[PDB]
Amino acid sequence: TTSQKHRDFVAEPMGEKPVGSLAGIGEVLGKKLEERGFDKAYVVLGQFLVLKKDEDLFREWLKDTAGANAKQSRDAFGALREWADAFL
Amino acid sequence: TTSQKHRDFVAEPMGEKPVGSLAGIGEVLGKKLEERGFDKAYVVLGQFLVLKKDEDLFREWLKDTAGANAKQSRDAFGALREWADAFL
Amino acid sequence: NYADLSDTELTTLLRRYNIPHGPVVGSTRRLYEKKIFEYETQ
């Protein structure tokens, strides 16, 4: 479930976790993200940080570049925001 | 004061530290990074992460963005790499 | 003029030339265009 993926992602350092571990990143989004060079969850975290953790900027970027819908971009944004609040 | 800056940088999560907290990022480099929009150390961490922790890409980007020489870029990279091995 | 290339097309050139790279995003576009230019002209 989405809640379980979010809870598991924010619970611990991400290390070398694949991009698919991020809540909101299913098979389709994960494959598009991997095609763009976002193989690991940390690469997506990098873009979130370069965008200064801005929700509107990150969500617009994920929707336009990877084909994410509003729900998926919110779930992925939320997992990264809460992970950074806990560990960064 | 590079070794002191490196030790303090890699010891804890970076939170809201400014870019000048990074080993290698002195007054000239820090001011230039902030003028380019890399206003916090986490923004530079973000860039290191979107560059897949690649030393050559990171050091080339830093030289082009802030005018870092080889030594400054080697030190900034090393501090981010050791921090990411510990906390990311 | 690499501006006409999409991020996907820029990524494809970096891969074709075996130039190590990560994602093409707003903060890396300038770097990868410079690297492509230097590799093509030198």
Numbering used by the authors:
A (entry chain A), B (entry chain B): 2 to 89
C (entry chain G): 3 to 44
Paper text:
Barrier-to-autointegration factor (BAF), encoded by the BANF1 gene, is an abundant and ubiquitously expressed metazoan protein that has multiple functions during the cell cycle. Through its ability to cross-bridge two double-stranded DNA (dsDNA), it favours chromosome compaction, participates in post-mitotic nuclear envelope reassembly and is essential for the repair of large nuclear ruptures. Phosphorylation of BAF by the vaccinia-related kinase 1 (VRK1) is a key regulator of BAF localization and function. Here, we demonstrate that VRK1 successively phosphorylates BAF on Ser4 and Thr3.
We also verified that pBAF still interacts with the LEM domain of emerin. We observed by ITC that both BAF and pBAF bind with a Kd of about 1 μM to the purified LEM domain. We even obtained crystals of the complex between pBAF and EmN that diffracted at a resolution of 1.4 Å. Determination of the high-resolution structure of the complex confirmed that BAF and pBAF adopt similar 3D structures in the crystal. At this resolution, the two phosphorylated side-chains as well as the Lys72 side chain were unambiguously positioned, and a salt-bridge between the side chains of pThr3 and Lys72 was observed. On the emerin side, only the LEM domain is visible in the crystal, the disordered region of EmN being probably proteolyzed during crystallogenesis, as previously reported. The position of the LEM domain on pBAF is similar to that observed for the LEM domain on BAF, as illustrated in Figure 7B. Consistently, a salt-bridge is present between pThr3 and Lys72 side chains in the 3D structure of pBAF bound to the LEM domain of emerin. Determination of the high-resolution 3D structure of the complex between pBAF and the emerin LEM domain confirmed that BAF and pBAF bind similarly to this domain. At the opposite, its interface with emerin is distant from its phosphorylation sites and exhibits no chemical shift variation upon phosphorylation.
